[PDB]
Amino acid sequence: MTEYKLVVVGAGGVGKSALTIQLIQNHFVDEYDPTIEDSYRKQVVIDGETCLLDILDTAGQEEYSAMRDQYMRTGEGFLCVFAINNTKSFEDIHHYREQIKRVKDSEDVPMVLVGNKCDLPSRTVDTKQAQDLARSYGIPFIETSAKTRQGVDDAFYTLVREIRKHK
Amino acid sequence: VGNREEKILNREIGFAIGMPVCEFDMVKDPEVQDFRRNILNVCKEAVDLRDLNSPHSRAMYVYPPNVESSPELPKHIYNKLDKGQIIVVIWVIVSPNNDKQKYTLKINHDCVPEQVIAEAIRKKTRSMLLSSEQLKLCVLEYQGKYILKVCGCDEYFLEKYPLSQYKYIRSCIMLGRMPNLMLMAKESLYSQLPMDCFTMPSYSRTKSLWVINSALRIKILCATYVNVNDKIYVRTGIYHGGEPLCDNVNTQRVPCSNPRWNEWLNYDIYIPDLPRAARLCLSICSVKGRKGAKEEHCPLAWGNINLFDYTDTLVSGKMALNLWPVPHGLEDLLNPIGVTGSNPNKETPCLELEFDWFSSVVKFPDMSVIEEHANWSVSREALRENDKEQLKAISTRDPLSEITEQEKDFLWSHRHYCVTIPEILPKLLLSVKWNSRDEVAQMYCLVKDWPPIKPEQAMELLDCNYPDPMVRGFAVRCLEKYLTDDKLSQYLIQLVQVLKYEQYLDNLLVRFLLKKALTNQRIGHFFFWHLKSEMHNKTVSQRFGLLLESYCRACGMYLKHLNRQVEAMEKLINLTDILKQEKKDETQKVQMKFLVEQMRRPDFMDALQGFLSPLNPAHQLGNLRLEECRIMSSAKRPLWLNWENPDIMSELLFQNNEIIFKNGDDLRQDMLTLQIIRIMENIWQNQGLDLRMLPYGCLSIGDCVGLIEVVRNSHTIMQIQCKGLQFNSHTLHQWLKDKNKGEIYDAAIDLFTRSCAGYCVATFILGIGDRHNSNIMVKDDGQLFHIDFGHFLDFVLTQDFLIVISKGAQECTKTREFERFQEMCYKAYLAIRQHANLFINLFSMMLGSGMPELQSFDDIAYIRKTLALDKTEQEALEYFMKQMNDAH
Ligand SMILES: COCCOc1ccccc1-c1nnc(Nc2ccc(CC(N)=O)cc2F)c2ccsc12
Ligand SMILES: Nc1nc2c(ncn2[C@@H]2O[C@H](COP(=O)(O)OP(=O)(O)NP(=O)(O)O)[C@@H](O)[C@H]2O)c(=O)[nH]1
Ligand SMILES: [Mg+2]
Ligand SMILES: [Mg+2]
């Protein structure tokens, strides 16, 4: 009856909500509905370990920056998501990871890096630049698309077994 | 009669009130049996109101909206929101094992609960997708199916109030917390509502007074049951409330060996001049002083008698009554404010009287004869802005301001014009010679069509100063038209006490309260406990018992829930009693071994689990975490009790409910003080001053037994200095900084100086005493408050507090921070002085109780000095600044 507490973090509009909604109800949204803090849960089979996933969709807008401290104290792992169109996504993703290691003084915290909207034929972020920072943080990396179910399982499932590495 | 359900109901309500209802059938008093029968239409009235718009009206009765008085938010409270909006977390249960998912929304504070749901429905539908099936099916069938519920307790938002008007949301705005609400189906709540089954019980199935040419005379034949410890005499006196209608007369002194008087006592009052509420107050006094010592007069026993019965009949012929023991001291040999009636205990001094017998049954004249005599007096008796302004000056006086005989004659002369200023009615009523039928007849006519006034002013007409039924009937009708349920719960303890001032069981005030108690279960909850807590007092046990019976007979299934609370309290009363009986001297360790050994018993552990908290019926109490239960370090062994919160989302409010159970101290005064502190905070908040108080819950459930709310994360300032190893004057600012560092520090100093100002003013106005370092507590964020309000009405500022107020500076008195502090005290002191009439009324309504610090109006006169009511408002401020800047 293992339960894994996952937290999806990132900037606004990067698709952190469409990623989770794509996982649970086999669905895709085209409406930019801004999120503050929602929660989702669904049972998943991973490597024979039938487990429950408690996902915490956060706010990409900087207006609710004070709420980040609490969900970072409770989350076991974090799903950092950047937009492959916005260069600002890769800039403030440094502050997100560095703040995670600040509320948890441990320099090693489960945290797989994700980059959504890979289905888009127009991309402004190089794949090697994400793999460069992924190796710098000692973390994996998954390129995903929220409308085509492109590895949205692999993006979350990697973090599930990443948390098992610490455990 | 022998209906099986009635035999069961009669047994259940007998357990809830402490006495079997068959004792009420034994009472041969025709007034008592008439009350049980005639009060039932009030029960029928409220049951019909519950079943009017069923099931929504039944849900409103069981879970009424805990709402504030006004939807308007003050300026300082509105600015606590993000551009007028509030962030609210909406929860919903999904798994059969009570797993939860959440939505957080940013909504206007004005939105009704149905519009908050409309945002959640809009947010959920935008995540899924459908065309002409989303708007058609999802939006239609998900609307009108759900309601909002507070996470952690049984509070529901069942009415279309603005969301911020609910007290839970209002507190989250003032504390910075985030509201956590739960969505549940309406039919899920309606299925849990009980079924109404109220049926009527089995017991439901010649000469005018003004034509008596005689003076009042009363015989005193003899007395029985007197134990000697020189001479005795009986002191009598005709009273209209607390005021005597003539001079008191005594009897000739008779040796206490064998007492016989058989003498007629004449009174300086004409029989046609007897007012309706005229009463005979008598007692038995002893004289113990001879041969070198000044003689001393002490009352042995007392007893009052209504001169008219509940059928408006003047009492005549022989009569006997048993007398009541002396009260907790007295300021005279008579006790007019005492209760009227004979003593049920027959091994008490019995006094045999005889009232004059006129050949016919004497009745009080009806209003048709009274109104005709009033127009006769005013016809035989057959505008100026100068004295018109004086009438407004008399209206603003406090209820205990001495109105001179010149001003009384001045008010009575302008009695037809002072209907323009209807709030002057209490002042005008006290300027009436109630020993004159000519005056009372004209006063009946004016109050007959008197303009209604505010509830705060009409309650003054319900204390011991206004015993006339026409005056009280007007005051009740004012409450029936203007008193909301919110204010009714606020002044419920005052309105319950003034029931003792009524001279008849079946009156108009008791019908208004009983109807509201059977219409609002939050009201009926505390209505039950205020009545039940005084069932030990044999002077009111018959009135309150018959009232509890009529309540429990029609309160619905909540009787079953109350019996759980009663049985749980009786188990705690029995445990702490034998804990004192057999283990009072033994140490706390062996006391605990006895405690836990008695709490593991099944009969016990079953009764102390699964019932509603008497402090707050919305708080459910589940399993008793007896590992966290302990005996505290106080005089009379208080019981620190810990329950688990059985709510599905208890973790969002609190998982453990901690309540202190005290058995030994009288908690009636602590209730009153905490109630007044709550009112003072409401006055300060509604006019700008953000002075946060802490009126923690406190409820008396019987003779010196009651519950006390535990306040979390609070430390006695001694426990602050004691951790830090003896007393120093800078430790308070250090611990407040060690718990509030960086940016958070300035807000803690802000909250500290505001709560300290509110309690400096509160403790000075109320004059609470014995304030020491163990009476003052501080929370983690800096909220200061006081505890243990044992004595009041019998000037606080300490260098340690001022250092924290001036943020650690040395010259704290000459600081811009301190100048802002005392400016809050000045505005708060005057704010209470402007509502001085309200607080004087609350104290005077509590005189009927047996509280030690409230026996006469001279005890209440203390707040006239602290509020400086006889001086001017500026002269009062000058008085307060000098009194609160002496040194300090
Ligand atoms: C009783 O039936 C549910 C009725 O819910 C509602 C009724 C009216 C308005 C809103 C909702 C409502 N719906 N979904 C919510 N989160 C939620 C999201 C996804 C799932 C599917 C899953 N496995 O992750 C399950 C969920 F629960 C939330 C969270 C706060 S309100 C609400
Ligand atoms: N074409 C396409 N659009 C996508 C994809 N993933 C997300 N989007 C779009 O990107 C927009 C933003 O989606 P959203 O999940 O709300 O982003 P967010 O990071 O959660 N924003 P916030 O943090 O403020 O809640 C939406 O219009 C959504 O349809 C994808 O794989 N393909
Ligand atoms: Mg989102
Ligand atoms: Mg509450």
Author numbering:
A (entry chain B): 1 to 167
B (entry chain A): 105 to 309, 324 to 347, 352 to 504, 523 to 864, 870 to 939, 954 to 1047
What does the paper say about this structure?
Mutations in RAS and PI3Kα are major drivers of human cancer. Their interaction plays a crucial role in activating PI3Kα and amplifying the PI3K-AKT-mTOR pathway. Active RAS interaction with p110α, along with phosphorylated receptor tyrosine kinases (RTK) interaction with p85, activates PI3Kα, allowing it to modify its lipid substrate, phosphatidylinositol-4,5-bisphosphate (PIP2), to phosphatidylinositol 3,4,5-trisphosphate (PIP3). Here, we present structures of KRAS, RRAS2, and MRAS bound to the catalytic subunit (p110α) of PI3Kα, elucidating the interaction interfaces and local conformational changes upon complex formation.
We recently screened a small-molecule library for anti-diabetic compounds that mimic insulin’s action and identified compounds that bind to p110α as molecular glues, enhancing its interaction with RAS39. The glue compound D927 increased the KRAS-PI3Kα interaction affinity by three orders of magnitude, facilitating the stable complex formation and enabling structure determination of the KRAS-p110α complex at 2.81 Å resolution. In the KRAS-p110α complex, the glue D927 is positioned near the interface, primarily binding to p110α and interacting with KRAS residues. Structural analysis shows that the glue compound D927 binds to the p110α-RBD at the interface within a pocket formed by the central β-sheet and rα1-helix. The p110α residues V196, Q205, Y207, K228, Y246, Y250, and L287 form the D927 binding pocket and predominantly interact via hydrophobic and van der Waals forces. These interactions stabilize the rα1-rα2 helix and intervening loop of p110α-RBD in a conformation conducive to RAS binding. At the KRAS-p110α interface, the amide group of D927 forms an H-bond with R41 (KRAS) and engages in van der Waals interactions with Y40 (KRAS). Structural analysis of the KRAS-p110α complex revealed that the glue compound D927 binds to an induced pocket in the p110α RBD and interacts with KRAS residues R41 and Y40, leading to the hypothesis that modifying the RAS-interacting group of D927 to create a steric clash with Y40 could disrupt the KRAS-p110α interaction.
